Scaffold this active site. Structure first.
Site, PDB file in Angstrom:
ATOM      1  N   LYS A  71     -13.165   6.204 -24.815  1.00 32.71           N
ATOM      2  CA  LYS A  71     -12.691   6.343 -26.259  1.00 32.71           C
ATOM      3  C   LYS A  71     -12.270   7.531 -26.654  1.00 32.71           C
ATOM      4  CE  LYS A  71     -15.386   4.003 -29.418  1.00 32.71           C
ATOM      5  NZ  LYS A  71     -16.528   3.535 -29.963  1.00 32.71           N
TER       6      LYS A  71
ATOM      7  N   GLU B 147     -18.425   4.995 -23.227  1.00 34.04           N
ATOM      8  CA  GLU B 147     -19.520   4.227 -23.884  1.00 34.04           C
ATOM      9  C   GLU B 147     -19.667   2.775 -23.298  1.00 34.04           C
ATOM     10  OE1 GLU B 147     -20.050   4.986 -28.701  1.00 34.04           O
ATOM     11  OE2 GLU B 147     -18.952   3.133 -28.479  1.00 34.04           O
TER      12      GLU B 147
ATOM     13  N   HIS C  44     -19.656  -6.961 -36.040  1.00 33.68           N
ATOM     14  CA  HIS C  44     -19.343  -5.495 -36.610  1.00 33.68           C
ATOM     15  C   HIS C  44     -20.254  -5.703 -37.995  1.00 33.68           C
ATOM     16  CE1 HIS C  44     -16.115  -2.659 -38.118  1.00 33.68           C
ATOM     17  NE2 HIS C  44     -17.366  -2.046 -38.034  1.00 33.68           N
TER      18      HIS C  44
ATOM     19  N   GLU D  51     -19.260   4.611 -35.461  1.00 30.93           N
ATOM     20  CA  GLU D  51     -18.404   5.766 -36.463  1.00 30.93           C
ATOM     21  C   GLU D  51     -19.039   5.797 -37.744  1.00 30.93           C
ATOM     22  OE1 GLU D  51     -14.409   5.919 -36.823  1.00 30.93           O
ATOM     23  OE2 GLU D  51     -14.158   3.496 -36.696  1.00 30.93           O
TER      24      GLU D  51
ATOM     25  N   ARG E 269     -15.558   7.713 -46.688  1.00 32.75           N
ATOM     26  CA  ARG E 269     -15.017   7.455 -47.902  1.00 32.75           C
ATOM     27  C   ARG E 269     -15.471   6.108 -48.485  1.00 32.75           C
ATOM     28  NH1 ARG E 269     -12.724   3.406 -45.726  1.00 32.75           N
ATOM     29  NH2 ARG E 269     -11.783   3.395 -43.723  1.00 32.75           N
TER      30      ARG E 269
ATOM     31  N   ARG F 196      -9.311 -10.897 -47.795  1.00 32.25           N
ATOM     32  CA  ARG F 196      -8.317 -10.060 -48.171  1.00 32.25           C
ATOM     33  C   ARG F 196      -6.920 -10.896 -48.057  1.00 32.25           C
ATOM     34  NH1 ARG F 196      -8.666  -4.093 -44.642  1.00 32.25           N
ATOM     35  NH2 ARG F 196     -10.989  -4.120 -44.936  1.00 32.25           N
TER      36      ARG F 196
HETATM   37  N1  JZK Z   1     -18.971   0.187 -27.222  1.00 33.41           N
HETATM   38  C1  JZK Z   1     -18.009  -1.167 -27.736  1.00 33.41           C
HETATM   39  O1  JZK Z   1     -18.396  -2.258 -27.067  1.00 33.41           O
HETATM   40  C2  JZK Z   1     -17.032  -0.885 -28.570  1.00 33.41           C
HETATM   41  C3  JZK Z   1     -16.091  -1.823 -28.955  1.00 33.41           C
HETATM   42  C4  JZK Z   1     -15.151  -1.983 -29.703  1.00 33.41           C
HETATM   43  C5  JZK Z   1     -15.213  -0.722 -30.534  1.00 33.41           C
HETATM   44  C6  JZK Z   1     -16.070   0.410 -30.357  1.00 33.41           C
HETATM   45  C7  JZK Z   1     -17.042   0.290 -29.446  1.00 33.41           C
HETATM   46  N2  JZK Z   1     -15.717   1.324 -31.139  1.00 33.41           N
HETATM   47  C8  JZK Z   1     -14.844   1.148 -32.058  1.00 33.41           C
HETATM   48  N3  JZK Z   1     -14.181   1.573 -33.056  1.00 33.41           N
HETATM   49  C9  JZK Z   1     -14.395   2.918 -33.194  1.00 33.41           C
HETATM   50  C10 JZK Z   1     -13.378   4.034 -32.411  1.00 33.41           C
HETATM   51  C11 JZK Z   1     -12.228   3.525 -31.606  1.00 33.41           C
HETATM   52  C12 JZK Z   1     -11.791   4.564 -30.818  1.00 33.41           C
HETATM   53  C13 JZK Z   1     -12.273   5.998 -30.656  1.00 33.41           C
HETATM   54  C14 JZK Z   1     -13.434   6.132 -31.366  1.00 33.41           C
HETATM   55  C15 JZK Z   1     -13.844   5.246 -32.154  1.00 33.41           C
HETATM   56 CL1  JZK Z   1     -15.394   5.542 -32.982  1.00 33.41          CL
HETATM   57  N4  JZK Z   1     -14.227  -0.275 -31.685  1.00 33.41           N
HETATM   58  C16 JZK Z   1     -13.509  -1.168 -32.595  1.00 33.41           C
HETATM   59  C17 JZK Z   1     -14.294  -1.685 -33.440  1.00 33.41           C
HETATM   60  C18 JZK Z   1     -13.303  -2.272 -34.774  1.00 33.41           C
HETATM   61  C19 JZK Z   1     -13.057  -3.872 -34.684  1.00 33.41           C
HETATM   62  C20 JZK Z   1     -14.115  -4.476 -34.539  1.00 33.41           C
HETATM   63  C21 JZK Z   1     -15.252  -3.676 -34.389  1.00 33.41           C
HETATM   64  C22 JZK Z   1     -15.199  -2.819 -33.496  1.00 33.41           C
END
Ligand code: JZK
EC number: 6.3.4.14
Lengths: 447, 380
Positions: free
Chosen positions: A161, A203, A211, A290, A294, A340
């Site tokens: 990530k 991760e 979520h 995360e 906002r 939505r």
């Molecule tokens: N650790 C994991 O399994 C994982 C999987 C998906 C992740 C996930 C983790 N984290 C994120 N998002 C945050 C992110 C993405 C790219 C770089 C940094 C961050 Cl914090 N996402 C996408 C979100 C949004 C859509 C539905 C819930 C999951």
């Protein structure tokens, strides 16, 4: 008590109208800044003052930092509300607003920078006692033996990530050592191109999570409260479709456990205003991913279940007033569902702009309609596809869903393509009706 | 639940009833006059029956036509709404003799309460305070009730409906300002006891004149109240769904201790009439836009291009705003009234804006004569 005299609404569409209503209830004068393509927006037509800040493309209007600050200066506004999207999580913008002597309706700019950098954000949450996803706990280097060792310690599957990423943008699932080097290399290249920051972290990849996100409020007086949770799992390609509050299967003990940790994290980081702690929820466990620094799109579901007007709290906090409620005054009552409403093509999922020829909004007990649209309104092609939000509340989940079905049947939006028919399908879905479907459900349902 | 019901009404209340039926999975039969084919609830109903020409006497008040429509459609119950046949005891008696469920009280209760002489005697007996007396500056305060006709009866706080023109309510609110939890419990318990004593079944309202901390019974509406939504906002109780559950023979599940007053709600009646002369304004609505937002509730069958017929009353909608307190509900009403667009016909929207901006209304507790004194109208 002292209140902000006049504010600039640095946004458009439904959220700008949502902010304008909160302002009027508090007696705050409004300045609607708009692009030349947005002169006919409902909130622009209801605003006390209007300033056209540039042409249709967001770069010269809604992302135009000098033009937004200049509008605040010329009208004598004292504060700027960024809404969601656009410049709301732009730390440079928050710094320039602070520097220019106007109040930024959000957290301190350094808090935005801290939480906006995903690596720094996880380290601060882990230190505060918030449960995080097991991972690298720092940036990845170029030593592949070290990278294979981190992957082994975590246990495959893993996800690479971008630290400058977020909301499902800048990530890649890795299932074995063979794909590891190329996946890290590709994520870095993508992150450098997109965010001008090649920093990546690793991760543990969770296979079937939900979520679940925690709503918080913190004032400048030391108070920090949690306003239960929302389940935002009903999503397609990282775009939320249905959100609900509270999350099904979450017990008051689990709510208290996670909420108190989030509220304590606000105190430790010196958080101010509205915020959201986003988690992945799998096998009765929360894992921080995360923080949203906002207001969120789906904030109305929290408002229905607690009675707390989140936008009015933001305005009160910014004015220097304490939170209007204490933690012991926050009570989860009933259930709320949000659909939505998007001007989108059901086959391509691409935005479907055009002129609305006939419009009819639903009504009734527990029915809330959040939208700027009206008969004769043209949805412009320059921005996102969202045109409205339909929120239904009931004393239980079954009543909220029953009311949503009725509300969607009364909703008339002709002249453009919408996801109304898809929303009806989701409400009729037997797995959604049982509740607790994971993040991959909608995509599996559609194909 | 009741399999299928006939909604023996029209306009906003008929739409209100249809939504409650749909939520409970009850099939709807919309009976309508030839002038009401385009009513929103008619267009949403599972089945429709034209019961006669435009005049109410030929349609909405036509007992044989309503019963015949209920028989042919295979319905099992009839909701009369408010007005029309809702308080017609002969209609209630005939609905039941025809083997249908009447969504209301027994015909004997409608008769008992429909006659001021026997009603006041029943209230004196039940222990409900009556006019002993000259009440020069009273407030209109009324108690919402629910009774299953099986021995259970609850009170769901009160409403203040003092803003009136020619004895017609213009603004309603819940709870009533200045009513203490002690006064609420006192009057409420007497109303619940009266329900049990008269064998009341369904939703009802006990209307009082309130002056110098004392209640004086005037009359009981033996049906759902027009202004029922303000009570729904502050208690969370869906009053129409409760009518439907009671009619299906279900005892009250809601206990008195489960009835909680939270926040405050205000209702502005929206009328198709001149805001100064009060000359009815039927006609085509050329442009329509409903208000939105947190705590905003819009109860209306109107839509752009819909014609308000000249044959019926002028009430076209109800705008209901809720808040954690009275000030928030009023502030939300001001905002909602500014968003409300109804063009092509005259409305009382501008009068409602003045009432919300009235300093005495903002303070609260204005008496039954207030509105007419503000407008300069002579009582009659
Ligand atoms: N650790 C994991 O399994 C994982 C999987 C998906 C992740 C996930 C983790 N984290 C994120 N998002 C945050 C992110 C993405 C790219 C770089 C940094 C961050 Cl914090 N996402 C996408 C979100 C949004 C859509 C539905 C819930 C999951």
């Amino acid at each position: 008590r002292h209140m902000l005299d006049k504010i600039v609404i640095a946004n458009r569409g439904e959220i700008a109208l949502r902010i304008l209503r909160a302002c009027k209830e508090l007696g705050i004068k409004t300045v609607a800044v708009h692009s030349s393509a947005d002169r006919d927006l409902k909130h622009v037509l209801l605003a006390d003052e209007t300033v056209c800040i540039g042409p249709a493309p967001s770069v010269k209007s809604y992302l135009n930092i000098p033009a937004i600050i200049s509008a605040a200066e010329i009208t004598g506004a004292v504060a700027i509300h960024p809404g969601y999207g656009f410049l709301s999580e732009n730390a440079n913008f928050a710094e320039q607003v602070e520097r220019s002597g106007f109040i930024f309706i959000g957290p301190k700019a350094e808090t935005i920078r801290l939480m906006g950098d995903k690596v720094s954000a996880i380290a601060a949450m882990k230190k505060a006692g918030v449960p995080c996803v097991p991972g690298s706990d720092g940036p990845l280097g170029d030593d592949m033996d070290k990278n294979r060792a981190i992957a082994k310690r975590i246990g495959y599957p893993v996800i690479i990530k971008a630290s400058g990423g977020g909301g499902g943008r800048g990530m890649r699932v890795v299932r074995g050592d063979a794909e590891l080097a190329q996946s890290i290399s590709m994520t870095r290249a993508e992150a450098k191109a997109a965010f001008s920051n090649d920093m990546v972290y690793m991760e543990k990849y969770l296979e079937n999570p939900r979520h679940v996100e925690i709503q918080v409020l913190a004032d400048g007086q030391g108070n920090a409260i949690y306003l239960a949770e929302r389940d935002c799992s009903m999503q397609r390609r990282h775009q939320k479709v249905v959100e609900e509050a509270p999350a099904p299967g979450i017990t008051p003990e689990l709510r208290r456990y996670i909420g108190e940790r989030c509220a304590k994290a606000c105190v430790d980081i010196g958080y101010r205003g509205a915020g959201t702690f986003e988690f992945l929820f799998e096998n009765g466990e929360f894992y921080f991913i995360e923080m949203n620094t906002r207001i969120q799109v789906e904030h109305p579901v929290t408002e229905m279940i607690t009675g707390v007007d989140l936008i009015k709290e933001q305005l009160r906090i910014a004015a220097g007033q304490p939170l209007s409620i204490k933690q012991e005054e926050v009570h989860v009552r009933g259930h709320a569902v949000e659909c939505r409403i998007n001007a989108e093509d059901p086959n391509t999922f691409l935005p479907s702009p055009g002129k609305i020829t006939r419009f009819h909004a639903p009504g009734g007990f527990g029915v809330r309609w959040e939208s700027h649209i009206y008969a004769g309104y043209t949805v412009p092609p320059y921005y996102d596809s969202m045109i409205g939000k339909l929120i239904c509340y009931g004393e239980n989940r079954d009543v909220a869903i029953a009311r949503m079905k009725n509300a969607l049947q009364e909703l008339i939006i002709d002249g453009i393509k919408t996801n109304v028919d898809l929303q009806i399908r989701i409400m009729n879905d037997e797995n959604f009706q049982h509740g607790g479907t994971n993040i991959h459900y909608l995509e599996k349902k559609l194909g």
